[PDB]
Design an enzyme around this catalytic site. Structure first.
Site, PDB file in Angstrom:
ATOM      1  N   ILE A  16       0.805  -1.214   0.000  1.00  0.00           N
ATOM      2  CA  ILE A  16       0.000   0.000   0.000  1.00  0.00           C
ATOM      3  C   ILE A  16       0.842   1.270   0.000  1.00  0.00           C
ATOM      4  CG2 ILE A  16      -1.796  -1.219   1.209  1.00  0.00           C
ATOM      5  CD1 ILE A  16      -0.956   0.307   3.712  1.00  0.00           C
ATOM      6  N   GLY A  17       2.137   1.108   0.242  1.00  0.00           N
ATOM      7  CA  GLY A  17       3.052   2.229   0.157  1.00  0.00           C
ATOM      8  C   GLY A  17       4.362   1.995   0.885  1.00  0.00           C
ATOM      9  N   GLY A  19       7.218   3.490   4.136  1.00  0.00           N
ATOM     10  CA  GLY A  19       7.360   4.228   5.372  1.00  0.00           C
ATOM     11  C   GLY A  19       8.842   4.276   5.655  1.00  0.00           C
ATOM     12  N   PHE A  21      12.393   3.498   6.331  1.00  0.00           N
ATOM     13  CA  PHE A  21      13.159   2.258   6.384  1.00  0.00           C
ATOM     14  C   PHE A  21      12.358   1.016   5.985  1.00  0.00           C
ATOM     15  CE2 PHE A  21      16.671   4.375   8.134  1.00  0.00           C
ATOM     16  CZ  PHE A  21      16.353   5.061   9.289  1.00  0.00           C
ATOM     17  N   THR A  23       8.681  -0.988   3.652  1.00  0.00           N
ATOM     18  CA  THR A  23       7.568  -1.078   2.707  1.00  0.00           C
ATOM     19  C   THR A  23       6.315  -1.422   3.504  1.00  0.00           C
ATOM     20  OG1 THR A  23       9.045  -2.047   1.022  1.00  0.00           O
ATOM     21  CG2 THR A  23       6.683  -2.184   0.651  1.00  0.00           C
ATOM     22  N   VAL A  24       5.288  -0.580   3.429  1.00  0.00           N
ATOM     23  CA  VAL A  24       4.082  -0.828   4.219  1.00  0.00           C
ATOM     24  C   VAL A  24       3.095  -1.727   3.472  1.00  0.00           C
ATOM     25  CG1 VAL A  24       2.131   0.195   5.419  1.00  0.00           C
ATOM     26  CG2 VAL A  24       4.297   1.377   5.395  1.00  0.00           C
ATOM     27  N   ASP A 129       9.592  13.489  12.386  1.00  0.00           N
ATOM     28  CA  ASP A 129       9.028  13.386  11.051  1.00  0.00           C
ATOM     29  C   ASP A 129       7.526  13.591  11.044  1.00  0.00           C
ATOM     30  OD1 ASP A 129       9.126  13.116   8.327  1.00  0.00           O
ATOM     31  OD2 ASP A 129       8.979  10.907   8.349  1.00  0.00           O
TER      32      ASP A 129
HETATM   33  C1  LIG Z   1       1.341   4.771   2.998  1.00  0.00           C
HETATM   34  O1  LIG Z   1       0.935   4.256   4.271  1.00  0.00           O
HETATM   35  C2  LIG Z   1      -0.404   3.932   4.360  1.00  0.00           C
HETATM   36  O2  LIG Z   1      -1.208   4.064   3.439  1.00  0.00           O
HETATM   37  C3  LIG Z   1      -0.749   3.417   5.722  1.00  0.00           C
HETATM   38  O3  LIG Z   1      -2.076   3.100   5.921  1.00  0.00           O
HETATM   39  C4  LIG Z   1      -2.169   2.669   7.204  1.00  0.00           C
HETATM   40  C5  LIG Z   1      -3.325   2.258   7.842  1.00  0.00           C
HETATM   41  N1  LIG Z   1      -3.284   1.855   9.135  1.00  0.00           N
HETATM   42  C6  LIG Z   1      -2.096   1.874   9.789  1.00  0.00           C
HETATM   43  C7  LIG Z   1      -0.926   2.290   9.148  1.00  0.00           C
HETATM   44  C8  LIG Z   1      -1.007   2.698   7.839  1.00  0.00           C
HETATM   45  C9  LIG Z   1      -0.034   3.176   6.871  1.00  0.00           C
HETATM   46  N2  LIG Z   1       1.301   3.387   7.013  1.00  0.00           N
HETATM   47  C10 LIG Z   1       2.206   2.994   8.025  1.00  0.00           C
HETATM   48  C11 LIG Z   1       3.169   3.863   8.445  1.00  0.00           C
HETATM   49  C12 LIG Z   1       4.045   3.468   9.423  1.00  0.00           C
HETATM   50  C13 LIG Z   1       3.932   2.232   9.974  1.00  0.00           C
HETATM   51  C14 LIG Z   1       4.742   1.684  10.963  1.00  0.00           C
HETATM   52  N3  LIG Z   1       5.721   2.327  11.523  1.00  0.00           N
HETATM   53  O4  LIG Z   1       6.347   1.531  12.492  1.00  0.00           O
HETATM   54  C15 LIG Z   1       4.262   0.284  11.262  1.00  0.00           C
HETATM   55  C16 LIG Z   1       3.082   0.088  10.300  1.00  0.00           C
HETATM   56  C17 LIG Z   1       3.024   1.390   9.575  1.00  0.00           C
HETATM   57  C18 LIG Z   1       2.129   1.734   8.602  1.00  0.00           C
END
Ligand SMILES: COC(=O)c1oc2cnccc2c1NC1C=CC2=C(NO)C=CC2=C1
Length: 262
Positions: A16-17, A19, A21, A23-24, A129
């Site tokens: 889905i994208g 983050g 360090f 890949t989420v 950030d």
């Molecule tokens: C482009 O990102 C998304 O579309 C995205 O959608 C989400 C929905 N629910 C939780 C997290 C995310 C998330 N991104 C995250 C960002 C950081 C995260 C973390 N940092 O430790 C752990 C899971 C993470 C999901």
């Protein structure tokens, strides 16, 4: 007690994208969860540290407004499991699908984001950030602060100037966070990314560095309260010692929230 998850339990799904360090992905592990994988092949000691760091921070956060850390995995790859939020990040809402919120809702989003930051800082956690990309709107009415890959105890439009020009060794402070929050306030109140009219990224860093450029505060929409526009200015102060700490920032938003609906 420990939070490590046994190999194979986590079911990785859609990508889905990205983050910090990693890949989420959206996954399954006792329900829907977001998973951030810190590699393909074998881990660098570069990555190995940022992993151990991040998990080490998350497991200090238990708040409604911080994205819930649920577990971590090393065995297949380095991965961080958190809860999952239906409905996207504040950035997506504001600049991609151009959701138009009501003023009461925008302030509320501001009040929660504030709330969570106060939490982190009270725990001596610096996010380093903050940006509407890492502010996730769960079920459309609850704000979760996400992605602590860079926190301690890339994207420049939120960086305070003291950060933008690297001097000395440590530019990052509670105040460098406030400034970032100041810009999402700006996003909230303008529905726009600052410096939108300048199409050169390097100019924008240089100029914000030397203090020639600042967010144009006249763009705030008419029904934004004077107290909010006034608080925004306070957080975007170029000198960092002139910025409010989040406890004070919180009280300010709560006050102007109570005298709004009338
Ligand atoms: C482009 O990102 C998304 O579309 C995205 O959608 C989400 C929905 N629910 C939780 C997290 C995310 C998330 N991104 C995250 C960002 C950081 C995260 C973390 N940092 O430790 C752990 C899971 C993470 C999901």
């Amino acid at each position: 007690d420990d939070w490590e998850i046994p190999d194979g339990q986590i079911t990785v799904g859609q990508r889905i994208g990205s983050g910090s360090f990693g890949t989420v992905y959206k996954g399954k592990w006792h329900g829907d969860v977001a998973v951030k994988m810190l590699n393909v092949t074998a881990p660098t000691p570069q990555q190995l540290q940022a992993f151990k760091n991040e998990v080490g921070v998350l497991r200090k956060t238990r708040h409604v407004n911080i994205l819930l850390f649920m577990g971590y995995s090393t065995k297949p790859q380095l991965a961080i499991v958190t809860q999952w939020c239906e409905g996207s990040s504040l950035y997506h809402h504001l600049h991609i699908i151009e959701t138009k919120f009501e003023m009461i809702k925008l302030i509320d989003i501001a009040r929660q984001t504030a709330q969570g930051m106060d939490y982190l800082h009270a725990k001596s956690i610096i996010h380093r950030d903050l940006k509407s990309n890492n502010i996730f709107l769960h079920e459309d009415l609850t704000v979760k602060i996400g992605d602590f890959g860079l926190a301690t105890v890339g994207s420049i439009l939120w960086m305070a100037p003291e950060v933008i020009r690297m001097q000395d060794k440590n530019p990052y402070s509670f105040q460098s966070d406030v400034y970032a929050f100041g810009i999402v306030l700006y996003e909230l109140m303008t529905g726009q990314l600052p410096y939108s009219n300048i199409n050169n990224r390097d100019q924008i860093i240089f100029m914000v560095g030397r203090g020639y450029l600042s967010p144009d505060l006249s763009k705030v929409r008419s029904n934004c309260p004077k107290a909010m526009k006034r608080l925004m200015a306070e957080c975007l102060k170029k000198k960092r010692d002139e910025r409010p700490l989040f406890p004070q920032i919180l009280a300010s938003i709560e006050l102007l929230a109570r005298s709004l609906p009338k």
